[PDB]
Design a binder for this molecule. Structure first.
Ligand SMILES: *[C@@H]1O[C@H](CO)[C@@H](O[C@@H]2O[C@H](CO)[C@@H](O[C@@H]3O[C@H](CO[C@H]4O[C@H](CO)[C@@H](O)[C@H](O)[C@@H]4O)[C@@H](O)[C@H](O[C@H]4O[C@H](CO)[C@@H](O)[C@H](O)[C@@H]4O)[C@@H]3O[C@@H]3OC[C@@H](O)[C@H](O)[C@H]3O)[C@H](O)[C@H]2NC(C)=O)[C@H](O[C@@H]2O[C@@H](C)[C@@H](O)[C@@H](O)[C@@H]2O)[C@H]1NC(C)=O
Ligand SMILES: *[C@@H]1O[C@H](CO)[C@@H](O[C@@H]2O[C@H](CO)[C@@H](O[C@@H]3O[C@H](CO[C@H]4O[C@H](CO)[C@@H](O)[C@H](O)[C@@H]4O)[C@@H](O)[C@H](O[C@H]4O[C@H](CO)[C@@H](O)[C@H](O)[C@@H]4O)[C@@H]3O[C@@H]3OC[C@@H](O)[C@H](O)[C@H]3O)[C@H](O)[C@H]2NC(C)=O)[C@H](O[C@@H]2O[C@@H](C)[C@@H](O)[C@@H](O)[C@@H]2O)[C@H]1NC(C)=O
Ligand SMILES: CC(=O)N[C@@H]1[C@@H](O)[C@@H](O)[C@@H](CO)O[C@@H]1O
Ligand SMILES: CC(=O)N[C@@H]1[C@@H](O)[C@@H](O)[C@@H](CO)O[C@@H]1O
Ligand SMILES: [Ca+2]
Ligand SMILES: [Ca+2]
Ligand SMILES: [Mn+2]
Ligand SMILES: [Mn+2]
Lengths: 239, 239
């Protein structure tokens, strides 16, 4: 069995196990700030940042046809300081082709280039979307399961607890092909759940990079923070 | 669309919306004690209790072939006062034929009569099992999805936070046929998730009773409490 796992209870600056892209930065306090925070302490608009684990993960094998089961857990907080304009755009946990660079920001969250369902993306993502684009349901924020498109195959609205830490658990069981995600806010006790069938062999390449991406809006002050405090991941490929 | 819903933020003694069976009792403090608590305040062994909602729920229609999506949420606590003998047996949320009475207690949790996979049971259950029987995995406690049998089709071990309140969310999406459950302990922040494919049309009758059942052990002091503080449920059958 081929297993891979990592656990960051906090982030240390200078760590070579994470690939920081775009605006992503690790503070001295051990926080991963996906999107830019200005000197005045306010979140900057027109910002895109990603963080990828430094080693590729073997998700499935074409020869044997076996697929890996995996689980990831992370904690984040989103603070929206202004009433106007509407905050944007969100953050997303994703898996896609290795050696990838940031795609389009804003509503595309740094992982897509347009709003089409294109098999060439070879990307699976679980988004926490804060702005309603034309391809989105009217309710924001919402959790969404993205399969080769920013147009989610399933969404679940949730109430943002401004600035509070949210705990996320995402699990994929290869036998049943179920991707199940949970979001919990310890501050209010709120629990949100979402699940859908996803056959990763029809979406992802055999080896993928795993990461987090965040993005702020296309207009002045259409922004919010996208801070991550911890991140763990484990995958097991039966051989 | 045929919808049904109920929400008990607390339980009131004398309420005619709940059918209490066996040892089940609602205290003056508003707590639903599924299994017996002696005058000395200790849980009694050889006790079985259930609570069913007073109205049957339309889960699916044979004529149109449509099936309902549903969600239930409840909070409970299990206190295990002794080191020896091992505590038992657990509690379970279930759906089965209408007008049913308690079945065998102990490891059968008040909803099964033996350890066979029998289609005649017509029962679906999500258990929180505290004792390892011969049909159980060695790890206890564990969450389990029971389909016409006490021998779960899927299990997920969890660590009991003795006497602390646990929050449970169980959701069934008819379109994908996914039954997903989550258990969260606010006291420790622990989150457990479990999911599996279950086609209710192959298990349950068109109309079912929904309830909670709990049971203590077959030997002296092999017991624990099974207290429920709140319970909500909603089901929607598309027509
Ligand atoms: C977080 O980042 C950490 C820093 O990079 C990761 O730890 C490194 O993990 C490396 C594995 O990829 C590991 O590399 C090996 O280092 C050996 C020498 O260092 C050890 O022994 C020294 C004494 O001899 C001692 O002084 C050191 O303190 C270490 O104990 C070296 O012998 C190995 O070489 C063999 O294997 C390579 C292939 O991997 C062959 O090419 C080579 O011929 C030989 O057979 C190996 O060296 C690395 O080889 C590849 C090359 O590109 C690298 O430059 C070279 O370093 C390295 O020792 C540790 N560093 C430390 C300080 O521990 C950490 O990885 C996790 O933890 C390690 C221990 C391992 O279990 C990994 O699988 C884990 O992922 C990162 N953590 C995470 C979660 O990603
Ligand atoms: C928790 O338990 C509560 C107590 O039982 C539930 O509330 C009852 O819900 C009954 C519905 O099943 C409801 O029954 C009706 O009562 C009507 C008379 O009472 C009202 O009007 C009076 C003035 O006329 C007023 O004084 C009262 O305070 C009430 O406002 C009565 O007219 C209805 O009869 C019609 O419908 C029946 C069929 O249901 C026909 O048979 C009949 O010919 C007529 O057409 C009806 O009466 C009931 O009929 C069936 C019979 O077996 C019953 O004995 C008889 O009572 C009842 O009014 C309320 N009680 C109260 C105090 O509100 C509660 O139900 C939920 O809330 C209600 C309001 C409703 O929305 C339900 O759908 C909800 O489930 C239970 N809650 C839950 C979550 O289960
Ligand atoms: C398609 C696109 O990028 N849309 C963006 C949206 O994502 C958000 O950033 C918004 C902020 O006002 O600006 C545009 O509408
Ligand atoms: C099959 C059966 O009822 N087994 C029971 C088990 O469920 C538990 O109650 C135990 C307590 O010591 O006693 C027996 O082993
Ligand atoms: Ca959006
Ligand atoms: Ca058992
Ligand atoms: Mn969206
Ligand atoms: Mn069991």
């Amino acid at each position: 069995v081929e297993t891979i796992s990592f656990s960051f209870s906090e982030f240390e600056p200078g760590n070579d196990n994470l690939t920081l892209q775009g605006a992503a930065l690790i503070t001295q306090s051990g926080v991963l700030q996906l999107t830019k925070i200005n000197q005045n302490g306010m979140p900057a608009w027109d910002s895109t940042g990603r963080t990828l684990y430094a080693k590729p993960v073997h998700i499935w094998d074409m020869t044997t046809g076996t697929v890996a089961s995996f689980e990831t857990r992370f904690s984040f907080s989103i603070e929206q300081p202004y009433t106007r304009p509407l905050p944007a755009d969100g953050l997303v946990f994703f898996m896609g082709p290795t050696k990838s660079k940031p795609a389009q920001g804003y509503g595309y969250l740094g992982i897509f280039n347009n709003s089409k369902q294109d098999n060439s993306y070879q990307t699976l993502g679980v988004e926490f979307d804060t702005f309603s684009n034309p391809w989105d349901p009217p309710q924001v924020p919402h959790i969404g399961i993205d399969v080769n498109s920013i147009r989610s195959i399933k969404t679940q609205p949730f109430q943002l607890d401004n600035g509070q830490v949210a705990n996320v658990v995402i699990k994929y069981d290869a036998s049943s092909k179920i991707l199940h995600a949970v979001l919990v806010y310890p501050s209010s006790g709120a629990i949100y759940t979402i699940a859908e069938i996803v056959d990763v062999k029809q979406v992802l390449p055999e080896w993928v990079d795993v990461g987090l991406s965040g993005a702020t809006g296309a207009q002045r002050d259409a922004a919010e923070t996208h801070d991550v405090y911890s991140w763990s991941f484990q995958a097991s490929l039966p051989e």
